[PDB]
Design an enzyme around this catalytic site. Structure first.
Site, PDB file in Angstrom:
ATOM      1  N   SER A 101      -2.113   7.198   3.031  1.00 34.71           N
ATOM      2  CA  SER A 101      -2.922   7.613   4.012  1.00 34.71           C
ATOM      3  C   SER A 101      -2.864   8.985   3.915  1.00 34.71           C
ATOM      4  CB  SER A 101      -2.373   7.296   5.316  1.00 34.71           C
ATOM      5  OG  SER A 101      -0.769   7.500   5.330  1.00 34.71           O
ATOM      6  N   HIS A 143       0.183  -0.489   1.836  1.00 35.13           N
ATOM      7  CA  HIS A 143       0.640   0.555   2.737  1.00 35.13           C
ATOM      8  C   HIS A 143       1.010   0.278   4.178  1.00 35.13           C
ATOM      9  CE1 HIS A 143       1.367   4.716   3.813  1.00 35.13           C
ATOM     10  NE2 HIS A 143       0.076   5.341   3.857  1.00 35.13           N
ATOM     11  N   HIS A 163      12.939  -2.249  -2.478  1.00 35.38           N
ATOM     12  CA  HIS A 163      12.011  -1.354  -2.995  1.00 35.38           C
ATOM     13  C   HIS A 163      12.142   0.202  -2.281  1.00 35.38           C
ATOM     14  CE1 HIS A 163      10.282  -2.802   0.718  1.00 35.38           C
ATOM     15  NE2 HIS A 163       9.515  -1.854   0.613  1.00 35.38           N
ATOM     16  N   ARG A 199      14.869   7.024   8.672  1.00 37.44           N
ATOM     17  CA  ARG A 199      13.905   6.214   9.787  1.00 37.44           C
ATOM     18  C   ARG A 199      14.384   4.827  10.086  1.00 37.44           C
ATOM     19  NH1 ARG A 199       8.329   6.891   6.591  1.00 37.44           N
ATOM     20  NH2 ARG A 199       9.911   5.643   5.174  1.00 37.44           N
ATOM     21  N   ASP A 212      10.253   0.111   7.931  1.00 38.05           N
ATOM     22  CA  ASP A 212       9.537  -1.110   8.346  1.00 38.05           C
ATOM     23  C   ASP A 212      10.602  -2.459   8.589  1.00 38.05           C
ATOM     24  OD1 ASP A 212       6.766  -0.009   8.427  1.00 38.05           O
ATOM     25  OD2 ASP A 212       7.243  -0.114   6.210  1.00 38.05           O
TER      26      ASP A 212
HETATM   27  O1  LIG Z   1       4.056   6.634   4.136  1.00 37.61           O
HETATM   28  C1  LIG Z   1       4.862   6.062   4.536  1.00 37.61           C
HETATM   29  O2  LIG Z   1       5.645   6.653   5.097  1.00 37.61           O
HETATM   30  C2  LIG Z   1       5.031   4.612   4.194  1.00 37.61           C
HETATM   31  C3  LIG Z   1       5.395   4.635   2.493  1.00 37.61           C
HETATM   32  O3  LIG Z   1       4.632   4.243   1.707  1.00 37.61           O
HETATM   33  C4  LIG Z   1       6.524   5.273   2.422  1.00 37.61           C
HETATM   34  O4  LIG Z   1       7.366   5.344   3.191  1.00 37.61           O
HETATM   35  O5  LIG Z   1       6.800   6.158   1.197  1.00 37.61           O
END
Ligand SMILES: O=C([O-])CC(=O)C(=O)O
Ligand SMILES: O=C([O-])CC(=O)C(=O)O
Lengths: 436, 436
Positions: free
Chosen positions: B244, B274, B320, B329, B375
């Site tokens: 993004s 993503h 991962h 987070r 997540d």
């Molecule tokens: O953009 C994000 O925060 C989700 C992601 O892929 C990461 O945390 O590496």
């Protein structure tokens, strides 16, 4: 073995390419192909070999090649419409997808396929019809394509957990669907903006893609349909590094469906550094003709050009490029114009400039490549046939460019390309890193 | 010196960073920072340092840092709402933009700014209201943001030939506008899909961004507003390499305006690699809870996990990551849940998994990072507060992520970053290149 079903043909090609890449990466995966410098990071990855994109390759001597075929080769080898002399975009897409020149039967099959899949869902029609005239055509295009992702077979199948092995199949179906729909979305935008919202009419199941497109645009001139065939063929692809190709690649790598990937790509194409060269040439031509009239002598035109370059201004369409010689995509369009509109005053100026600008640019010693590119010639031709709405030229570019990026997208998923994820650093970070 | 106008503050910071980079590139522009291998090209630029992105940097030991500040530091330092404990997204955006922790007054000023700029044009309202219920919320979000580019000050000014030196200014204005509008677009989508098309109501000019957002969503629980403040703060940015951020960067490099750049970015965020991790965790938690019941013992749960890994499946949210420990987070959200919903049965399972999964993954010795990411925790919290519509979760991530990518976008244009243009190669091309 099916001789016309592109999907079956593509199923038989895929395993062989997978095997070939597997072997290539075993033997040479660790081979260094370049270095990364600080300057490259600040300068948008310039000169950095960064991605694999299979469908087209810039040949420094011959210009863009589509799966090894040069533009003149494509002009000779690709099938044409009946009673036509311009290569059909269908055959180009077949070429990009399979690596092989299609037969007539294969092209005709593809035409019928795209005609069958061309329906727009009513929510997209409603949305287009409600857009106001101050909403840029490229924004309408991107928004509509995003809204078409409700039709994505790939989004649905991924949510049901289908095997990775089947990704390319659904990507293939969605890409075929999107390609089929694009002329309908684009023509609807054209008509709503520039023909007071009149209908696009119907798809004829026996016409090629370009001819359904010009019909839906409201044009009825056989040579405009021929121009459109050529235009759509030659703008189809130009490697992976340009913003529209790269954006589609990058979004597609997250397994976003082709509608989402293509719409993102159009937002990149809409960028004034990627998408406006055609318009810029035409604006400049028009101003030039207003200033010096429609019948300026070669001698007065040479003085004008001399003076414009000496006062620090450029001649649009000339002076940039990797190529040693004229872009074959320019030559194509010159040939077209010599055949069909040799008396047109703007064309005659474009032809005069072709004789004069390069020799002036050589003499002045400022530009490495004095020859013109494709965008030097496209505008005069579109205008000649009545397509004067310059804001819209980038939609045409996008409809063309769908062919290349979606042909690649299918292959990206067929070959299991992963998420594109380079490493970023801050300036602060980079400074610490180099001190080490 | 203005002590609250972010634009003036930013105007004084820019020249100094330009000077610093100019000097850095003179002295070390040629410095090699890495090699490009064939494998990197096929593997989505993995491990390739490819871009400069200033606003955040992943600390390999401590997790993501926002201009040098860790998340727990930001939790302490960033202003809060009156009568609140969570950091306001406003102050995060100020931090990313200036590099400085904002004062109370600066945050209060920013809240009023975003409240003033919040209006939607009627064409975007109409478009949202006409979308059907089967059009995914992320597609509605991207399409609306693209349609908002009619409001872009940058697009207009670039077409009038504005000096390069002024790009960041109009980029700043458009980014402020977009950020202000996003909660309105997002809540309209929420209400049209999940509250029978009821209105989002009014912006209160004295509330913070998060609280106008939760009001427009139809929520009233103060602790949901507090969750939203935290959620929006912590998802704001995560370097330039995620899809993004990188998509916004890439599109923005073509001088596409922030609306176009952000909309493209959301199409990347919509991608199942993503953006769907939150939903996937929640679905798996729910299934697990049904299967083994509430208050499963540690032992039964450990067996379940061992059996899942031994049958070749992964545990969603775990396994991962480049990070060697728990994502901060994740920790933030665990702390929130311990304070406000400690006895929620789904939360208790999420907490049980935190005790058990990482230990099992260590023991198994395969997956290189056994700890969970953000997540793993988000869904149970959203569900607890009544936001059960999983399709929508990614919209929240996108509203958050606007803060980071648009803070960087301003800087990218301030610093004159050029078009992102790597070089692509075909497989056949790469094979020829390595033989040389
Ligand atoms: O953009 C994000 O925060 C989700 C992601 O892929 C990461 O945390 O590496
Ligand atoms: O997209 C293309 O056709 C490649 C491109 O931008 C250019 O070289 O002008």
């Amino acid at each position: 073995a099916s001789s016309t079903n592109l999907k079956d043909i593509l199923a038989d090609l895929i395993p062989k390419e997978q095997a070939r890449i597997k072997t290539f990466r075993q033997q040479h995966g660790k081979t260094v192909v370049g270095q990364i410098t600080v300057d490259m990071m600040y300068g948008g990855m310039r000169g950095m070999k960064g991605l694999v994109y299979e469908t087209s390759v810039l040949d420094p001597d011959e210009g863009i090649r589509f799966r090894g075929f040069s533009i003149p080769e494509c002009q000779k080898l690709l099938p044409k419409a009946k009673g036509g002399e311009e290569p059909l975009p269908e055959g180009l897409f077949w070429l990009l997808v399979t690596g092989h020149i299609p037969t007539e039967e294969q092209v005709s099959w593809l035409s019928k396929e795209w005609a069958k899949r061309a329906a727009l869902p009513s929510h997209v029609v409603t949305m287009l019809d409600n857009f106001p005239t101050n909403l840029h055509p490229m924004s309408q295009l991107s928004a509509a394509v995003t809204a078409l992702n409700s039709e994505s077979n790939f989004a649905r199948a991924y949510a049901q957990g289908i095997s990775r092995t089947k990704y390319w199949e659904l990507i293939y179906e969605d890409s075929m669907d999107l390609i089929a729909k694009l002329p309908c979305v684009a023509a609807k935008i054209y008509r709503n903006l520039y023909r007071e919202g009149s209908g696009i009419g119907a798809i004829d199941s026996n016409l090629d893609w370009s001819h359904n497109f010009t019909n839906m645009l409201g044009y009825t001139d056989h040579q405009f349909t021929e121009l459109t065939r050529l235009y759509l063929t030659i703008h189809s692809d130009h490697e992976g590094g340009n913003v529209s190709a790269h954006t589609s690649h990058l979004v597609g790598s997250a397994l976003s469906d082709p509608y989402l990937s293509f719409a993102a790509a159009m937002n990149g194409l809409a960028g004034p550094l990627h998408g406006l060269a055609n318009q810029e040439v035409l604006v400049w031509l028009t101003q030039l003709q207003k200033e010096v009239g429609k019948d300026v002598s070669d001698e007065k035109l040479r003085d004008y050009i001399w003076n414009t370059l000496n006062s620090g201004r450029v001649v649009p369409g000339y002076g940039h490029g990797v190529l040693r010689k004229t872009d074959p995509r320019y030559t194509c369009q010159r040939e077209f114009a010599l055949k069909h509109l040799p008396n047109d005053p703007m064309f005659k100026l474009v032809a005069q400039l072709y004789k004069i600008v390069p020799n002036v640019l050589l003499e002045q010693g400022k530009a490495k490549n004095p020859w013109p590119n494709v965008d030097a010639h496209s505008g005069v031709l579109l205008q000649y046939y009545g397509m004067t709405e310059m804001n819209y030229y980038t939609v045409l570019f996008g409809v063309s460019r769908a062919l290349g990026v979606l042909a690649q997208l299918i292959w990206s998923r067929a070959l299991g390309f992963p998420l594109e994820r380079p490493k970023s650093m801050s300036t602060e970070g980079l400074m610490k890193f180099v001190d080490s």
